[PDB]
Amino acid sequence: MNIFEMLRIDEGLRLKIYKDTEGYYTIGIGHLLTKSPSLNAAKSELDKAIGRNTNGVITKDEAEKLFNQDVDAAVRGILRNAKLKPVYDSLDAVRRAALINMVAQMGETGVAGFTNSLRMLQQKRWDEAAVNLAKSRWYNQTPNRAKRVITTFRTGTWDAYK
């Protein structure tokens, strides 16, 4: 298992514009197009991202390319983030992937707001952090995915994904 297979399982793959769990226009492997309520606005963003007049549809290879860019950016954002870097650096490889998953889903700002959990993770207080992570909108809105990530932080294994 790895970061790519992990997020691919969590986000799925869709080749036509669609609305995510929050109702925002997305495409491919969880790639947010825009928060605007406008389909045209979404199609314009898509074409700009892909580099061609897509007509709201992309191929597999194009989804995957967006996906590569998104993982790379997420990792890079983490490393440039004063609040996240230290946590990231303190973690083992499996748990690092759990952190990337949260960032890919809610952005840097969003994750960086779980101050208390972040400190517990850094301290290697696994059980306590999983309990704190669970007290959140994130867990209440997407419980299945949140449980998989939380289990990953708790055990440091990919069991939840198998």
Ligand SMILES: [Cl-]
């Ligand atoms: Cl883009």
Ligand SMILES: [Cl-]
């Ligand atoms: Cl879910």
